[PDB]
């Protein structure tokens, strides 16, 4: 697994990068921020994250912000694949509760 501290600082930087890019309602995507987003996310694309770390570090929430309308689909696909992987690794019945409460 990954340490809580790595996930937590990465989550904080992701959220700060996200908030910086919002010009009011509109997402502004610089070359440098596009590249900073990829760098932060690709450190998490190799992490095995536990349910407890999802609860405590909020790393899934911080990655999920980049599924919003203003971000390039290259970044949105990356965020989606990272979260898909973490969700699938959860125990099957945990997947079922989170899903069933949602239907």
């Amino acid at each position: 697994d990954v340490t809580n501290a790595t996930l937590e600082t990465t989550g904080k930087e992701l959220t700060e990068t996200y908030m910086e890019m919002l010009n009011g309602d509109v997402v502004e995507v610089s070359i440098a921020n596009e590249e900073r987003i990829v760098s932060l996310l690709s450190s998490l694309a190799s992490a095995n994250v536990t349910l407890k770390q999802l609860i405590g570090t909020k790393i899934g929430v911080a990655v999920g912000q980049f599924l919003s309308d203003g971000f390039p689909p290259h970044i949105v696909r990356f965020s989606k694949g990272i979260l898909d992987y973490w969700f699938r690794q959860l125990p099957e019945e945990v997947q079922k509760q989170l899903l069933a409460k949602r239907a």
Binding site: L51, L54, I55, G60, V61, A62, V63, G64, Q65, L67, S68, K80, L83, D84, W86, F87, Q95, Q97, L98, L99, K101, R102
Partner: peptide
Amino acid sequence: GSTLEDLFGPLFYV
């Protein structure tokens, strides 16, 4: 208990 939104944010879906 935890919801999918608690863990993955309000935009994620399976």
